[PDB]
Amino acid sequence: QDELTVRGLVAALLIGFIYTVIVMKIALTTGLVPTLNVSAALLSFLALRGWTRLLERFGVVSRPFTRQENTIVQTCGVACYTIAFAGGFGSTLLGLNKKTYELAGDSPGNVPGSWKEPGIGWMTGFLLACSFGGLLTLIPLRQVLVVDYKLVYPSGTATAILINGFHTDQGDKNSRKQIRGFLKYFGGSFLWSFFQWFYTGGDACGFVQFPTFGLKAWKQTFYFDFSMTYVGAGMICPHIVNISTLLGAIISWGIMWPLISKNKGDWYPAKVPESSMKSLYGYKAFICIALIMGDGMYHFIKIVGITAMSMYRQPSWMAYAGYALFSVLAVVTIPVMFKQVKWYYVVIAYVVAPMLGFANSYGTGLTDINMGYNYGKIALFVFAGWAGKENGVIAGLVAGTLVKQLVLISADLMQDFKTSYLTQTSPKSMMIAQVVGTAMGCIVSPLTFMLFYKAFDIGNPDGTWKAPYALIYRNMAILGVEGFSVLPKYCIVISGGFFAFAAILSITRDVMPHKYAKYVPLPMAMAVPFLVGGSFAIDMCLGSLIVFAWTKINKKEAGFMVPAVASALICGDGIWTFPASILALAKIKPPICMKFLPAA
Amino acid sequence: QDELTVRGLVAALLIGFIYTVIVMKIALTTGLVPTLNVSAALLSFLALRGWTRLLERFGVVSRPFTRQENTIVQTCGVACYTIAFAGGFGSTLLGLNKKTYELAGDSPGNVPGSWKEPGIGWMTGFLLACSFGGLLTLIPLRQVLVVDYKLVYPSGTATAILINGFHTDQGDKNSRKQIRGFLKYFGGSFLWSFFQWFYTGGDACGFVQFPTFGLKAWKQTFYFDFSMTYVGAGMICPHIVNISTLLGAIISWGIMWPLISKNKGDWYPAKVPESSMKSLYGYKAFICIALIMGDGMYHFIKIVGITAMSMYRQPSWMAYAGYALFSVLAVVTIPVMFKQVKWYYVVIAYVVAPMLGFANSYGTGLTDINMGYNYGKIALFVFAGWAGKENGVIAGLVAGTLVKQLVLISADLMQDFKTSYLTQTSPKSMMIAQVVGTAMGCIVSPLTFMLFYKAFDIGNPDGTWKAPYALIYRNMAILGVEGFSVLPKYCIVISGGFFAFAAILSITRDVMPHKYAKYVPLPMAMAVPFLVGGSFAIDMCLGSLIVFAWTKINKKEAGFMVPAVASALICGDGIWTFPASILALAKIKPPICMKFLPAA
Ligand SMILES: CC(C)CCC[C@@H](C)[C@H]1CC[C@H]2[C@@H]3CC=C4C[C@@H](OC(=O)CCC(=O)O)CC[C@]4(C)[C@H]3CC[C@]12C
Ligand SMILES: CC(C)CCC[C@@H](C)[C@H]1CC[C@H]2[C@@H]3CC=C4C[C@@H](OC(=O)CCC(=O)O)CC[C@]4(C)[C@H]3CC[C@]12C
Ligand SMILES: CC(C)CCC[C@@H](C)[C@H]1CC[C@H]2[C@@H]3CC=C4C[C@@H](OC(=O)CCC(=O)O)CC[C@]4(C)[C@H]3CC[C@]12C
Ligand SMILES: CC(C)CCC[C@@H](C)[C@H]1CC[C@H]2[C@@H]3CC=C4C[C@@H](OC(=O)CCC(=O)O)CC[C@]4(C)[C@H]3CC[C@]12C
């Protein structure tokens, strides 16, 4: 009790509903889904405190609003609208339409019978079959990642400190300074993000696209964006993670991509545009996943090996028993909706999902970057190649959704579990909130999507309701119909080499003594700057430099003030994401565009 | 003794010589003469300390290098290169050439016999006749302005604190914090100015031309440039000065100029470009000088009235006796060089010079802005109208130089006297340094100018050595040949109205009780934003806002730390002016141009 409340369920439903509308409409118009996890924590506090104070004003007495209750409300609210974008409503499930089929055009794999129309009944059934699969895998993941590996989730840590500060009324020698120090940088970060908004009024202009080291380095993604989220995240991360991130940027963007791009006419065709698996993006996706798989497989096998040895020498199996039940339920249900999907396609997806989900959850616990979109695109490509021209596009799209959603749900909610750990929230109550929130998400989102779908015209390339990613994901399946031959030359060989390189580094860190194991780079921390630019790496290294400078200047103060200052920078930028979404919701666009030119 | 040293004279000659070359070449190529007063103080310290330490390394003993000696060296050095730009070598004396005469073209007033060629003999004689006139007027001005009126010269105050910090080795509870606090902001301001340099690579782009309130307000000069000099200057100025500066910007740029510009076809011709006395710049120059004259005349008359009453009831006259001697020497000498100039033209110039010099020196003591260039342009216009088409262009140019130089010398060296006051430097030793420095300036500058003039081609509009202001000043004289009829409609009436308005405000402040005299705006502080934009006013108000916020937060700390922090911001930007000049000297230009566009 005192954590699961009726008022909390009502507040979570309201927050989950309004956030679903914001996420859905933005996805159906621009496709740039914002991260609104931090804003939900603030809205949960304001809504419930206002309700309690309203009762106080009228004389009605209510139960005290504690920090554990606030975490549960955010947890239920987050899972409600997470399905809105993790379910592929604007990316993959929208790519099954006949409208998207016609936009793709006449091409191999795009057979006349590979289009599906949206509907409330099948979408709700599709989500319920697969949404409750990731939740069961989370229970074993919480122990190994949050409490055993002690991974720091910067978004989870920042939200936990924010939630604690709201409910911390104790007067201590440090508590007062923690809150006041948090407020000074929270307001500054929010105003800084608010100020930047007026000058990001075009393609690649603003403080985000600032060439701090010149235009030549900026085009190589080696600039410094003024993002306090990445600076704040890097402050609470260990230096080895921040250094490893810089190495990945230098190896990929400073060495590898310039060298590989020198063969734009020999290795891969030059007529095809970039950002496609046939041209220079095959290297981006496959090498990046190779590093994570090379490191993720070693860790996952080691955990199984340790567990196997412990049992041989002698609720963990309860979660997997329930996971198998939902896995079978999905296997018997999904091919009924889609004749294209075969029964064993779903079995393979569910078998490798805990492994893929573990890798992304582990990666999110180091660099605060959720790479579940990359896994869905890779899973879409391989599954599309597992079927011929017939029943291939739908097979890739549907199988991609299962992998994309389960992996995204895992990483997103692991940070939410990190918040519960720091706020002394009961894990069993957290499990109930996610199940209730996910169940409502599987009902609200299909209803919300159909309300937009029926009222407006979605998918028109020359209209307000344009979904660019619906066609992009459709083209990935069409290109994925053909096998691995479409990948550029030496793409598999280099990926296999980096798989070995990732494997060697993982082994090297656990075999060498602890003295020399503090300097081995992390293979999957280096993998993040392979898809995103090196600007993220520079920001993380700046955060470590600030902590390194602060620690030397004042060892005592930096011990307890760095988490508070780092959280304020993350929260302040995170809070502004809600007004920025509303401005984007109301078609209000930035007035000015701060462009940089080479003294033309 | 201990202030006038042989090593100081040698160092001042070297600093004065190198600064003359930098000022002369920049004036002959771009015309944007930098303010290098702060950089001279640092170079004086480094040069002499290195000389003393070199003697220490070799075992040679030397007299201790004190703060008074440092002030004298900067004083002699500043006066040496001040004549380089205050003498109109690149603006007015270059406008007398036959090359400039041909560029002006066929127009009334530009008679065939109104060109003069440069020469070492007459230029040296011309300067010696008029350069030592302003110095004598300074001696009475020091008492009334520096010590009696207690005007704060932000550049003089900042240099004095910088010079004191170099020679302050005492260990006190506050002295250590004063120096360390100065160093933190001095390095930050220097790096900030250094960082901005790479992005100001074009016409109106960079952090200086930042539309902090939108593009509409920026075109109205109501933006916030990131200039730490103006922010630092406003911190040590009283709030009434900073508020009055904002009022002048709102009245002129927010009300007057938009309304007057609405008559671009009726009041003044629209074909003629702006920034000319015939179109919208007559209002800028005449109204701005009207406010200063309205306030300056009241103060100057009051000082004479107080002095007259004191004598009636009963070295001041020594300075004026010497000033009259040089005034007569100029009168008998200048018309010999120029047949165009008549004897009584010089007499009128020297009679009104102490009045004009007092007004600019008083204005420089409030807003740290030297407006002697405006007086020279106004003096050029009226004196050109005092002669017909014959002997009119030369009469305006020559008479403009006397007014421009004497007024510029007064304001520039009054800040130097403010430095001596705070550094406990002997005023009589300061007088000797200025005379020696001015005498060398009248010799080095004509030699330096002729070295460039003989070696290269100066005045070519399509060459590296282009002097835009030489022709602009030439056109002012040609337009000034015709009388006050060329001024736009109602220009004199509005200027006369603001003359009364300035007079009323000056009287109102001294007649009302001290309780209500703290809120009367200063007429000549409002006059500064009439020529420059309102961005300067905003920066000054930001500095007052910082002090107002700092004082409320910590009354004790803001008492002694504000001058140190304000000086560091001014000095840091001032020091960078020297490397920026060297980069401009070596034809090195900024790489990037940070342009702002309306989301085109
Ligand atoms: C003490 C700390 C704060 C150091 C400050 C960081 C410097 C190492 C950075 C800041 C500005 C940077 C410069 C910003 C811009 C350029 C322009 C760039 O020239 C271009 O190529 C621009 C486009 C073009 O000219 O074609 C060359 C690198 C350079 C000098 C960068 C080099 C590295 C600099 C000096
Ligand atoms: C200390 C922390 C806070 C970050 C500071 C990093 C920068 C000072 C340095 C480190 C890595 C450097 C980069 C390392 C590698 C490259 C690759 C190089 O790319 C190419 O070789 C061009 C290839 C082509 O022509 O396409 C251009 C310089 C650049 C961007 C360097 C620019 C300056 C960077 C970003
Ligand atoms: C708490 C403190 C820090 C307040 C922050 C200052 C605000 C009062 C300033 C900062 C940004 C300013 C905005 C910056 C840019 C614009 C664009 C401007 O639109 C334009 O006209 C741009 C050119 C065009 O669109 O044609 C309208 C004013 C506005 C909203 C400005 C209004 C005033 C703002 C919000
Ligand atoms: C508080 C301190 C630190 C300075 C902050 C000042 C700004 C918040 C305000 C004060 C004065 C304002 C200005 C007052 C007057 C005008 C005149 C107005 O000009 C016109 O009427 C346009 C004329 C034309 O169309 O040519 C445009 C708005 C502007 C620039 C305002 C923009 C916003 C300003 C700069």
What are the phi and psi torsion angles at B87 (to 5°)?
-80, 0
Are B369 and B532 a contacting pair, CB within 8 Å?
yes
Name the residue among B396, B304, B407, B289 with its Cα closest to residue B354.
B407
B349: left (phi over 0), alpha (psi -120 to 50) or beta: alpha
Q: How far apart are the CA of A243 and the centre of ligand 2, in A? A: 15
The pair of three-digit structure tokens given for residue B319, joined into one six-digit string: 């300075």
Contacts of B196 in chain A (CB under 8 A): none
Closest CA of chain A from B207, distance in Å: 11
Q: Where are the alpha helices (DSSP H) in B456-593?
A: 468-481, 491-511, 523-531, 535-553, 555-585
What is d(CA B211, CA B201) in angstroms, rounded to the nearest whole number?
17
Question: Which amino acid, residue A404?
Answer: K
The partner residues of B279 in beta bridges, in order of sequence, read B276
Which helix (H) or strand (E) is B393 found in, with range? helix B393-422
Residue B338 within any structural domain of the chain: yes
Question: Is B169 in a helix, a strand, or coil?
Answer: coil
What is d(CA B235, CA B150) in angstroms, rounded to the nearest whole number?
16
Kindly state whether B206 is in contact with chain A, defined as any CB-CB distance less than 8 angstroms: no
User: Gaps after which residues in chain B, C–N over 2.5 Å?
Assistant: 314
A394 HSE (CA, 13 A, CB side): 21
Distances (CA, A) of A476 to A88, A95, A277, A471: 14, 10, 8, 9
What is d(CA A284, CA A528) in angstroms, rounded to the nearest whole number?
10
Residue A598 within any structural domain of the chain: no
The pair of three-digit structure tokens given for residue B527, joined into one six-digit string: 């006059």
Please state at what angle helix A393-422 crosses helix A154-167, rounded to 10 degrees: 40
Question: Which amino acid, residue A71?
Answer: T
Residue B453: which domain range?
6-585
What is d(CA B427, CA B142) in angstroms, rounded to the nearest whole number?
9
User: How many residue pairs from chains A and B have C-beta atoms closer than 8 A?
Assistant: 58
Best mutation site among A213, A542, A596, A597 for ligand 1 pocket (most ligand atoms within 8 Å of CB): A213
Residue A593 within any structural domain of the chain: no
Angle among Cα B467, B197, A225 to the nearest 5 degrees reads: 150
Q: How far apart are the CA of A223 and the centre of ligand 1, in A? A: 10
What is d(CA B506, CA B529) in angstroms, rounded to the nearest whole number?
19
Closest-lying ligand to the alpha carbon of A597? 1
The pair of three-digit structure tokens given for residue B589, joined into one six-digit string: 């230009």
Residue in this structure with the two tokens 């020469």, named with its chain if needed = B119
What is d(CA A452, CA A23) in angstroms, rounded to the nearest whole number?
12
Q: Minimal Cα distance from A213: which residue of B? A: B198
What is d(CA B229, CA B178) in angstroms, rounded to the nearest whole number?
19
Are B566 and B29 a contacting pair, CB within 8 Å?
no
Name the residue among B534, B474, B592, B549 with its Cα closest to residue B244.
B534
Closest CA of chain A from B213, distance in Å: 10
Residue A58, burial from CB neighbour count under 10 angstroms (0-12, 13-18, 19+): exposed
Residue A198, burial from CB neighbour count under 10 angstroms (0-12, 13-18, 19+): middle
| Cα end-to-end span (Å), chain B | 67
| Cα end-to-end span (Å), chain A | 67
Please indicate whether, in this complex, the C-beta atoms of A597 and B215 are within 8 angstroms of each other: no
Mutation target among B205, B209, B223, B592 for the A interface, most CBs of A within 10 A: B592
What is d(CA B419, CA B219) in angstroms, rounded to the nearest whole number?
37
Residue B534 within any structural domain of the chain: yes
The partner residues of A594 in beta bridges, in order of sequence, read B596
B597: nearest CB among A589, A595, A599: A595
Are A215 and A594 a contacting pair, CB within 8 Å?
no
What is d(CA B17, CA A595) in angstroms, rounded to the nearest whole number?
42
Residue A137 within any structural domain of the chain: yes
Eight-class DSSP state of A266? T
Please indicate whether, in this complex, the C-beta atoms of A590 and B599 are within 8 angstroms of each other: yes
Residues in contact with B315: Cβ distance below 8 Å, sequence separation at least 6, in sequence order: B139
Please indicate whether, in this complex, the C-beta atoms of A589 and B598 are within 8 angstroms of each other: no
Decide whether any atom of ligand 2 lies within 6 Å of the A250 Cβ: yes
Name the residue among A37, A490, A7, A536 with its Cα closest to residue A242.
A536
Name the residue among A275, A245, A257, A267 with its Cα closest to residue A220.
A257
What is d(CA B595, CA A598) in angstroms, rounded to the nearest whole number?
10
Question: Which amino acid, residue A347?
Answer: V
Are B201 and B593 a contacting pair, CB within 8 Å?
yes
Residues in contact with A20: Cβ distance below 8 Å, sequence separation at least 6, in sequence order: A80, A81, A84, A441, A444, A445, A448
What is d(CA A379, CA A401) in angstroms, rounded to the nearest whole number?
9
Q: How many helices (H) and strands (E) does chain A have?
A: 22, 1
Are A397 and A96 a contacting pair, CB within 8 Å?
yes
Contacts of A594 in chain B (CB under 8 A): 594-596
Closest-lying ligand to the alpha carbon of A214? 1
Contacts of A596 in chain B (CB under 8 A): 199, 592-595
Please indicate whether, in this complex, the C-beta atoms of A594 and B593 are within 8 angstroms of each other: no
The partner residues of A200 in beta bridges, in order of sequence, read A593
Name the residue among B286, B285, B343, B472 with its Cα closest to residue B397.
B472
Are A45 and A74 a contacting pair, CB within 8 Å?
no
Name the residue among A461, A353, A458 with its Cα closest to residue A409.
A353
Distances (CA, A) of B262 to A171, A427, A545, B284: 63, 71, 56, 15
Are B534 and B230 a contacting pair, CB within 8 Å?
no
Kindly state whether A211 is in contact with chain B, defined as any CB-CB distance less than 8 angstroms: yes
* Declared resolution, Å: 2.9
Residue B238 within any structural domain of the chain: yes
What is the DSSP annotation of A14-44?
HHHHHHHHHHHHHHHHT------HHHHHHHH
Question: Is A458 in a helix, a strand, or coil?
Answer: coil
What is the DSSP annotation of A97-141?
SHHHHHHH-S-TT--TT------HHHHHHHHHHHHHHHHHHHHHH
A105: left (phi over 0), alpha (psi -120 to 50) or beta: left
CA B473 to chain CA centroid, nearest Å: 18
Kindly state whether A598 is in contact with chain B, defined as any CB-CB distance less than 8 angstroms: yes
What is d(CA B329, CA B125) in angstroms, rounded to the nearest whole number?
11
Please state at what angle helix A343-367 crosses helix A316-337, rounded to 10 degrees: 130
Are B596 and B199 a contacting pair, CB within 8 Å?
no
Question: Which amino acid, residue B200?
Answer: T
| Helix, strand, coil share (%) of chain A residues, nearest 5 | 70, 0, 25
Contacts of B202 in chain A (CB under 8 A): 597, 599-600
Kindly state whether B199 is in contact with chain A, defined as any CB-CB distance less than 8 angstroms: yes
The pair of three-digit structure tokens given for residue A293, joined into one six-digit string: 């798989």
Best mutation site among B198, B199, B592 for ligand 1 pocket (most ligand atoms within 8 Å of CB): B198
The pair of three-digit structure tokens given for residue B427, joined into one six-digit string: 């005023």
What are the phi and psi torsion angles at A344 (to 5°)?
-80, -15
Residue A336, burial from CB neighbour count under 10 angstroms (0-12, 13-18, 19+): exposed
Decide whether any atom of ligand 3 lies within 6 Å of the B598 Cβ: yes
What are the phi and psi torsion angles at A59 (to 5°)?
90, -5
What is the DSSP annotation of A365-428?
HHH----HHHHHHHHHHHHHHTS-STT-HHHHHHHHHHHHHHHHHHHHHHHHHHHHHHTT--HH
CA dihedral sign of residues B57, B62, B65, B70:
negative
Decide whether any atom of ligand 2 lies within 6 Å of the A545 Cβ: yes
Are A360 and A370 a contacting pair, CB within 8 Å?
yes
Question: Which amino acid, residue B253?
Answer: W
Kindly state whether B600 is in contact with chain A, defined as any CB-CB distance less than 8 angstroms: yes
Please state at what angle helix A67-86 crosses helix A427-455, rounded to 10 degrees: 40
Name the residue among A38, A128, A112, A25 with its Cα closest to residue A570.
A38
Residues in contact with B174: Cβ distance below 8 Å, sequence separation at least 6, in sequence order: B560
Q: From the CB of residue A564, how many other CB atoms can be counted at a distance below 10 Å?
A: 23
Decide whether any atom of ligand 2 lies within 6 Å of the A541 Cβ: yes
Which helix (H) or strand (E) is A172 found in, with range? none
Name the residue among B582, B130, B524, B460 with its Cα closest to residue B323.
B130
Name the residue among B100, B116, B198, B178 with its Cα closest to residue B478.
B100
A175: left (phi over 0), alpha (psi -120 to 50) or beta: alpha
Residue A597 within any structural domain of the chain: no
Distances (CA, A) of B364 to A428, B409, B496: 73, 12, 23
Name the residue among A458, A479, A470 with its Cα closest to residue A401.
A470
The pair of three-digit structure tokens given for residue A542, joined into one six-digit string: 């700046």
A204: left (phi over 0), alpha (psi -120 to 50) or beta: left
The partner residues of A391 in beta bridges, in order of sequence, read none
Residue B591, burial from CB neighbour count under 10 angstroms (0-12, 13-18, 19+): middle
Are B153 and B365 a contacting pair, CB within 8 Å?
yes
Question: Which amino acid, residue A298?
Answer: Y
Q: How far apart are the CA of B253 and the centre of ligand 4, in A? A: 8
Question: Which amino acid, residue B497?
Answer: G
Q: How far apart are the CA of A522 and the centre of ligand 2, in A? A: 21
Counting from 1 in the atom list of ligand 1, the atom nearest the Cα of B191 is 3
Counting from 1 in the atom list of ligand 3, the atom nearest the Cα of A201 is 25
What is d(CA A369, CA A229) in angstroms, rounded to the nearest whole number?
11
Are A393 and A109 a contacting pair, CB within 8 Å?
yes
Which helix (H) or strand (E) is B244 found in, with range? helix B239-249
Question: Is B446 in a helix, a strand, or coil?
Answer: helix
Question: Is B395 in a helix, a strand, or coil?
Answer: helix
The pair of three-digit structure tokens given for residue A74, joined into one six-digit string: 């955010």
Residues in contact with A318: Cβ distance below 8 Å, sequence separation at least 6, in sequence order: none
Eight-class DSSP state of B162? H
Eight-class DSSP state of B382? H
Decide whether any atom of ligand 4 lies within 6 Å of the B337 Cβ: no
What is d(CA A360, CA A343) in angstroms, rounded to the nearest whole number?
26
Which helix (H) or strand (E) is B88 found in, with range? none
What is d(CA A332, CA B422) in angstroms, rounded to the nearest whole number?
90
What is d(CA B502, CA A330) in angstroms, rounded to the nearest whole number?
86
Which helix (H) or strand (E) is A449 found in, with range? helix A427-455
What are the phi and psi torsion angles at B280 (to 5°)?
70, -10
* Expt. technique: cryo-EM
Residues written for chain A: 600
What is d(CA A90, CA A72) in angstroms, rounded to the nearest whole number?
28
CA-based radius of gyration for chain B: 24
Question: Which amino acid, residue A166?
Answer: F
Distances (CA, A) of A257 to A176, A251, A283, A521: 50, 8, 9, 20
Please indicate whether, in this complex, the C-beta atoms of B597 and A202 are within 8 angstroms of each other: yes
Please indicate whether, in this complex, the C-beta atoms of A591 and B214 are within 8 angstroms of each other: yes
Find the farthest-apart pair of alpha carbons in chain A and give their distance in angstroms, rounded: 78
The partner residues of A593 in beta bridges, in order of sequence, read A200, B597
Kindly state whether B597 is in contact with chain A, defined as any CB-CB distance less than 8 angstroms: yes
CA-based radius of gyration for chain A: 24
Mutation target among B196, B205, B583 for the A interface, most CBs of A within 10 A: B205
Question: Which amino acid, residue B521?
Answer: P
Distances (CA, A) of B406 to A488, B141, B350: 76, 13, 9
Residue A297 within any structural domain of the chain: yes
Name the residue among A448, A455, A471 with its Cα closest to residue A127.
A448
CA A436 to chain CA centroid, nearest Å: 21
Q: How far apart are the CA of B219 and the centre of ligand 4, in A? A: 10
The pair of three-digit structure tokens given for residue A139, joined into one six-digit string: 């229970």
The count of structural domains within chain B is 1
Question: Which amino acid, residue A507?
Answer: I
Angle among Cα B491, B379, B383 to the nearest 5 degrees reads: 95
Residues in contact with B360: Cβ distance below 8 Å, sequence separation at least 6, in sequence order: B292, B370, B371, B372, B375, B407, B408, B410, B411
Are B465 and B452 a contacting pair, CB within 8 Å?
yes
Q: How many helices (H) and strands (E) does chain B have?
A: 22, 1
Residue in this structure with the two tokens 């380089």, named with its chain if needed = B84
Name the residue among A578, A521, A566 with its Cα closest to residue A157.
A566
Please state at what angle helix A523-531 crosses helix A535-553, rounded to 10 degrees: 130
Closest CA of chain B from A211, distance in Å: 9
Name the residue among B566, B459, B470, B594 with its Cα closest to residue B157.
B566
Q: From the CB of residue B406, how many other CB atoms can be counted at a distance below 10 Å?
A: 28
CA dihedral sign of residues B434, B440, B442, B446:
negative
What are the phi and psi torsion angles at B542 (to 5°)?
-65, -40
